[PDB]
């Protein structure tokens, strides 16, 4: 759609066969006549090496759409590759919650033995003192 040298919409696109990036024929031709090189990569290129854009041959194409079978298959990659990252958001957050639950239930199991002894000791002090 654009010419990489000028930045215009090229009216005669010709693609190079060394550092291809669709150039305008009239622009690239002058670049070759200046010095036999490709403007981007600075690799050697002649005018015969450059090739105009063409209809493929005899197989008829249709424009790139959502229906087209290959475009539909690359779509289903995007679906699954995104959903695979959705699983990491829940696998990584699960490893924090279960790690905080493990330390929480351990602090609960370490503390409730001290609640059981104070309920013993404060009642034993009431059982001892009241009898005297």
């Amino acid at each position: 759609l654009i010419c990489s040298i000028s930045n215009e919409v090229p009216e005669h696109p010709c693609v190079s066969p060394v550092s291809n990036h669709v150039y305008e024929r009239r622009l690239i031709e002058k670049y070759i006549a200046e010095n036999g090189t490709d403007p981007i990569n600075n690799q050697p290129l002649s005018e015969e090496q450059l090739i105009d854009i063409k209809v493929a041959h005899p197989i008829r194409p249709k424009p790139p759409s959502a229906t087209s079978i290959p475009a539909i298959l690359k779509a289903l990659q995007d679906e699954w590759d995104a959903v695979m990252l959705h699983s990491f958001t829940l696998r990584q957050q699960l490893q924090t919650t279960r790690q905080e639950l493990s330390h929480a239930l351990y602090q609960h199991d370490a503390a409730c033995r001290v609640i059981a002894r104070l309920t013993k000791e404060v009642t034993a002090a009431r059982e001892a003192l009241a009898t005297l």
Binding site: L1, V9, E11, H12, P13, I53, E79, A82, V83
Partner: protein, 93 residues
């Protein structure tokens, strides 16, 4: 002159029967089918969010590309038209 592809393709056309794709995704064993509908619906609603964010700007940017693609074909229609009439012009004399 193709591999297995040609055998099943010619058989599908001759028999007049398309191969059935079962993706019970729509109806919902149904505990799974239900849980399928949720994740794809959440992916759907996220897939409609990133489209609406850009909105019509992403569409009309591609519409401009299609006009650059079209005009190039009709320039070649002219170049062929001129050289075709130019050959006939030499024959006439």
């Amino acid at each position: 002159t193709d591999i297995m592809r040609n055998e099943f393709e010619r058989l599908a056309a001759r028999q007049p029967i398309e191969l059935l794709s079962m993706k019970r995704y729509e109806l919902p064993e149904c505990v799974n089918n239900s849980m399928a509908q949720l994740e794809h619906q959440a992916v759907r609603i996220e897939n409609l969010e990133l489209m609406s964010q850009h909105g019509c700007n992403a569409w009309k940017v591609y519409n401009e590309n299609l006009v650059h693609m079209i005009e190039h074909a009709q320039k070649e229609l002219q170049k062929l038209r001129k050289h075709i009439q130019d050959l006939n012009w030499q024959r006439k004399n």
